[PDB]
Amino acid sequence: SPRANEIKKGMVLNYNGKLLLVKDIDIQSPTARGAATLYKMRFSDVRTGLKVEERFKGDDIVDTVTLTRRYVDFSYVDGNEYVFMDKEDYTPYTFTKDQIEEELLFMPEGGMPDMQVLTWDGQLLALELPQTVDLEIVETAPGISARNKPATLSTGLVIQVPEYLSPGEKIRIHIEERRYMGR
């Protein structure tokens, strides 16, 4: 019987007929004298990819599902469908663009190491990426301080990078924080 104050980013809740992946938790301090601390959670509906927000009291009872992770390789894209394959038993995992939209801003067209899938008793839930990714800059102002400029990466993602960077350079990105880490 888990409570809301014990929930962390990465868990999946069974809440009001939906399976919700926890994306963010904001511990909000009391709004007024006598009020309680509240837990504002941001979720992603694993079936539709739609965002859901809910606020809970610390002791509210929730239901977390048991998760199973499996290492995967990106197999191929077919329009809206994205096929991955289990590196061990070669089981295919098909996601729609909606379900992995935010992960697609970081995943290069050849996939990447340390990629996992979240499952619950045979049901495919989400794609879990590693901490960092190396992506090539396609569009940026000519490389010429402590000041950053915008850069469009191969996946379409726009990020802030140092002035001297030029198009075609491969850069390291912290996925969770969307920050440049170096070449």
Q: Which amino acid is at 26?
A: D
Q: Which residues make beta-bridge pairs with 117?
A: 70, 127
Question: Which residue reads 């809970």 in tokens?
Answer: 56
- Are 167 and 149 in contact by the 8 Å Cβ rule? The answer is no
Method of determination?
Answer: X-ray
Q: Write out the two tokens for 173.
A: 């990105």
Residue 164 CA to residue 57 CA, distance in Å, equals: 48
Resolution in A: 2.3
H helix or E strand, kind and range, residue 180: strand 179-182
Question: Which residue reads 């290069």 in tokens?
Answer: 108
Give the SS3 label for residue 4.
helix
Taking residue 133's Cβ as centre, other Cβ atoms within 10 Å add up to 21
In sequence order, which residues have a C-beta less than 8 Å from that of residue 176 and are 6 or more positions away?
131
Q: Is 1 exposed, middle or buried (0-12, 13-18, 19+ CB in 10 A)?
A: exposed
Q: Write out the two tokens for 74.
A: 């990106």
Walk me through the domains of the chain, giving residue ranges and CATH numbers. 4-57 (2.30.30.30), 68-128 (2.40.50.140), 132-182 (2.40.50.140)
Question: Which residue reads 């995943």 in tokens?
Answer: 107
Residue 125 CA to residue 105 CA, distance in Å, equals: 18
Residue 146 CA to residue 178 CA, distance in Å, equals: 18
76: Cα separation from own chain's centroid? 20
179: Cα separation from own chain's centroid? 14
Q: DSSP state, 183?
A: -
Residue 3 CA to residue 61 CA, distance in Å, equals: 5
CA distances from 19 to 50, 67, 174 (A): 11, 12, 27
Pairing of strands 92-96, 51-57: unpaired
Q: How many residues does the chain have?
A: 183
Q: DSSP state, 67?
A: P
Q: DSSP state, 122?
A: T
- Are 169 and 183 in contact by the 8 Å Cβ rule? The answer is yes
